[PDB]
Write an enzyme that holds these catalytic residues in place. Sequence first.
Site, PDB file in Angstrom:
ATOM      1  N   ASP A  56      56.921  40.432  61.535  1.00 45.45           N
ATOM      2  CA  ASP A  56      55.742  40.668  61.337  1.00 45.45           C
ATOM      3  C   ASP A  56      54.910  42.002  61.671  1.00 45.45           C
ATOM      4  OD1 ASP A  56      52.710  40.299  61.210  1.00 45.45           O
ATOM      5  OD2 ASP A  56      52.865  38.570  62.711  1.00 45.45           O
ATOM      6  N   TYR A  69      39.442  42.268  51.199  1.00 45.96           N
ATOM      7  CA  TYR A  69      40.642  42.631  50.520  1.00 45.96           C
ATOM      8  C   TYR A  69      40.584  43.767  50.257  1.00 45.96           C
ATOM      9  CZ  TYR A  69      44.753  43.342  47.540  1.00 45.96           C
ATOM     10  OH  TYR A  69      45.741  43.823  46.910  1.00 45.96           O
ATOM     11  N   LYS A  94      42.030  47.456  51.900  1.00 51.54           N
ATOM     12  CA  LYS A  94      42.964  48.483  51.340  1.00 51.54           C
ATOM     13  C   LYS A  94      42.424  49.886  51.371  1.00 51.54           C
ATOM     14  CE  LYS A  94      46.451  45.994  49.890  1.00 51.54           C
ATOM     15  NZ  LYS A  94      47.863  46.216  50.262  1.00 51.54           N
ATOM     16  N   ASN A 141      46.370  45.288  37.617  1.00 53.65           N
ATOM     17  CA  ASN A 141      47.023  43.903  37.909  1.00 53.65           C
ATOM     18  C   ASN A 141      48.315  43.821  37.396  1.00 53.65           C
ATOM     19  OD1 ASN A 141      44.031  43.466  38.377  1.00 53.65           O
ATOM     20  ND2 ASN A 141      45.008  41.141  38.483  1.00 53.65           N
ATOM     21  N   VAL A 146      49.273  35.559  35.649  1.00 54.30           N
ATOM     22  CA  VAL A 146      50.381  35.772  34.630  1.00 54.30           C
ATOM     23  C   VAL A 146      51.558  34.745  34.971  1.00 54.30           C
ATOM     24  CG1 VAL A 146      52.297  36.786  33.071  1.00 54.30           C
ATOM     25  CG2 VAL A 146      49.845  38.095  33.568  1.00 54.30           C
ATOM     26  N   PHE A 193      38.526  30.925  35.097  1.00 49.58           N
ATOM     27  CA  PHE A 193      37.187  30.893  36.063  1.00 49.58           C
ATOM     28  C   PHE A 193      36.095  31.458  35.265  1.00 49.58           C
ATOM     29  CE2 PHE A 193      41.174  30.877  38.577  1.00 49.58           C
ATOM     30  CZ  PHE A 193      40.879  29.750  39.335  1.00 49.58           C
ATOM     31  N   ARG A 241      41.095  42.201  33.150  1.00 48.76           N
ATOM     32  CA  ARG A 241      42.064  42.871  33.872  1.00 48.76           C
ATOM     33  C   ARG A 241      42.800  44.119  33.241  1.00 48.76           C
ATOM     34  NH1 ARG A 241      38.711  40.836  36.967  1.00 48.76           N
ATOM     35  NH2 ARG A 241      39.093  39.601  38.784  1.00 48.76           N
TER      36      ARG A 241
END
EC number: 5.1.3.2
Lengths: 311, 311
Positions: free
Chosen positions: B56, B146, B150, B175, B190, B206, B213
């Site tokens: 980890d 997220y 990054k 993506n 996908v 959604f 994308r």
Amino acid sequence: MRALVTGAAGFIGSTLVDRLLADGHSVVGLDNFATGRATNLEHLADNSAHVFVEADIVTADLHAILEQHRPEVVFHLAAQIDVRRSVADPQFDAAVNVIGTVRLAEAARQTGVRKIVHTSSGGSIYGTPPEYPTPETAPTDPASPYAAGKVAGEIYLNTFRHLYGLDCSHIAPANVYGPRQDPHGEAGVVAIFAQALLSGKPTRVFGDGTNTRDYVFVDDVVDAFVRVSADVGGGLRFNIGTGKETSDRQLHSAVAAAVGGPDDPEFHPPRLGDLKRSCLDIGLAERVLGWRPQIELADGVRRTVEYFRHK
Amino acid sequence: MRALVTGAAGFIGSTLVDRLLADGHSVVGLDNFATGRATNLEHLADNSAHVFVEADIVTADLHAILEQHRPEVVFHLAAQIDVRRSVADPQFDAAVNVIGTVRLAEAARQTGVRKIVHTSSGGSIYGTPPEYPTPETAPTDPASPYAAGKVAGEIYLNTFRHLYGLDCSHIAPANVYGPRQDPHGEAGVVAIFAQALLSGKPTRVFGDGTNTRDYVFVDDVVDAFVRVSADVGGGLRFNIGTGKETSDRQLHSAVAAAVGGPDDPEFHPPRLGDLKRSCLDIGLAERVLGWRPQIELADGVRRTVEYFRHK
Ligand SMILES: NC(=O)c1ccc[n+]([C@@H]2O[C@H](COP(=O)([O-])OP(=O)(O)OC[C@H]3O[C@@H](n4cnc5c(N)ncnc54)[C@H](O)[C@@H]3O)[C@@H](O)[C@H]2O)c1
Ligand SMILES: NC(=O)c1ccc[n+]([C@@H]2O[C@H](COP(=O)([O-])OP(=O)(O)OC[C@H]3O[C@@H](n4cnc5c(N)ncnc54)[C@H](O)[C@@H]3O)[C@@H](O)[C@H]2O)c1
Ligand SMILES: CC(=O)N[C@H]1[C@@H](OP(=O)(O)OP(=O)(O)OC[C@H]2O[C@@H](n3ccc(=O)[nH]c3=O)[C@H](O)[C@@H]2O)O[C@H](CO)[C@H](O)[C@@H]1O
Ligand SMILES: CC(=O)N[C@H]1[C@@H](OP(=O)(O)OP(=O)(O)OC[C@H]2O[C@@H](n3ccc(=O)[nH]c3=O)[C@H](O)[C@@H]2O)O[C@H](CO)[C@H](O)[C@@H]1O
């Protein structure tokens, strides 16, 4: 308003607590005494408008705390503050400054907080910009883990603003000095110099002593926090400084003068992670917040030395 | 070269391991199986040039691991990858993506690693950008935790670059899709579509299905990692995509046409944190690295569907 100040047992934090109380606010202080001092808040023991919570922002149940106290504004000053320490342990620095900020934002967005006023580091975040004094439009380029985590904190809070409409502004001070700055701290050159020169102990500057900083008095910084706490400057950083440069050597001379006696520092090697030059453009704070620094270095150094004598 | 890939048991990670092996490199794979699958690496059981380490990044002794294997390049693909999960638990996402990256860098700078190739997120870091397709010069403006993590990761690695000369480049894919993408998550449209439609199970888009994308095939992304691992693009981000926008609805149609069943997705509420549009300008990768994507969506969808048909 109901206010909550993290890092409230600290130098700037305790000063801010005092100002908020003077303005008629109720104030929750929060600190884990990593670097803070009980004596910074001891005068408030019988003030019913002030409540103190001992909590580590990394592990404490901040949700529960904020749910209990219901602050309208959170002033976030709790942080690992030492650049050298951040180099020595970047993980610890990131846990307090990034994870701590994230946990606070996540708590705040769930507990009806209007706004978080973050404390960035105007001094460290810009790195080596092409412009001095440096405006907020200059790209960030951190060269220490401390600086990086400060930027990271701004970005996260901006993210929570997008996500939840939790308002934020980032107070980005230059080099802050004045009463209550820890004499025995690893950082805080003015306090370090005043402490050493008053006890006739050796002093030092780093490199050839030509490093420059922008020295801003704590009371001026506190005023900026207050101004930005309103519904203004959302998602914006404000540089809080004087826009004037003082070298390490010149500061030593200025403190030595106020103390009286010798102006003869040692010269030690440069410290890994320390920038050579720092000076903030404070135009945005003036245009947007109406904020201007009131205290010049000479006057501020007097007030500071005055404090250290009485103690 | 001696390579180490964090996130090696994952989709892109396992594919990158294969490529590095094929190029004649030795590879240490590191993963904790948070989202990775042993089955992604099982074909390497008797491959002589790969060794796996179960660890980890947040808590393991990365110093000792790097000291033992002495990788020249660390391809850093270990991360919390789900935008919605990052919204649900920003602390956990920050711990893996920021703290993990910091721990990795701190270990790397002490163990003679030449370069860390970071995985940013070209799809998310810009938030809503000024223009599409979006170049690396556009400001970052993350609108999910997220995305924020990054960005912070990039900044920390740039910081370690300043401090220690530990080199870094940031691969910022759009993506990514293709064989080995987990079809059982909420991320990886996908794969989700392909497996569900093959099994005649329900699918969904959604909102109104108009989200776009930039879909880039895993093999292309993997080629970008390889190119950037050399002494090129230090401190720089490279957008890795196709610069073509495909809507959720259009994507579903493409996958359904490849599978051969109905094209009738359910419509579900919009997901907090998900951007509406994403499209990357890939000019910089082309000039600097000579990188161009080879696989068009229709081709890529076919290859993906066929992987899932036989798995
Ligand atoms: N002093 C400066 O020149 C200057 C200028 C720019 C930025 N800042 C920022 O101002 C803020 C206050 O710094 P200061 O100069 O008053 O230093 P300080 O050390 O006096 O204050 C920091 C306070 O935060 C507390 N704290 C630290 N980690 C904590 C944790 N995990 N949980 C709870 N409390 C914690 C400390 O105990 C301390 O009381 C910090 O965010 C610092 O980074 C300082
Ligand atoms: N898939 C995309 O569209 C895309 C594009 C942009 C960015 N990325 C980034 O690419 C990388 C690979 O993602 P992916 O699509 O292959 O997803 P994935 O989930 O298949 O791969 C991520 C891997 O990281 C591992 N990991 C997670 N936390 C860990 C920890 N604490 N310690 C060790 N290993 C840990 C997981 O077990 C997994 O094997 C990630 O950094 C992701 O954020 C993905
Ligand atoms: C430029 C920069 O990053 N500034 C930030 C940084 O201050 P600094 O890390 O610069 O603060 P500091 O008080 O440690 O150093 C200020 C200056 O004094 C010099 N010095 C220091 C000690 C000594 O004994 N002798 C001496 O000459 C030092 O070389 C430097 O040029 O961190 C602070 C928090 O702690 C704030 O975030 C500041 O904005
Ligand atoms: C724009 C953006 O931020 N992209 C990033 C983000 O991808 P995303 O979070 O966009 O990836 P995803 O696969 O979860 O969704 C992609 C698209 O497919 C749609 N969808 C998804 C699932 C489903 O069952 N049905 C459906 O229609 C969804 O509405 C979206 O428009 O995170 C990835 C890591 O995981 C990468 O970092 C990407 O760069």
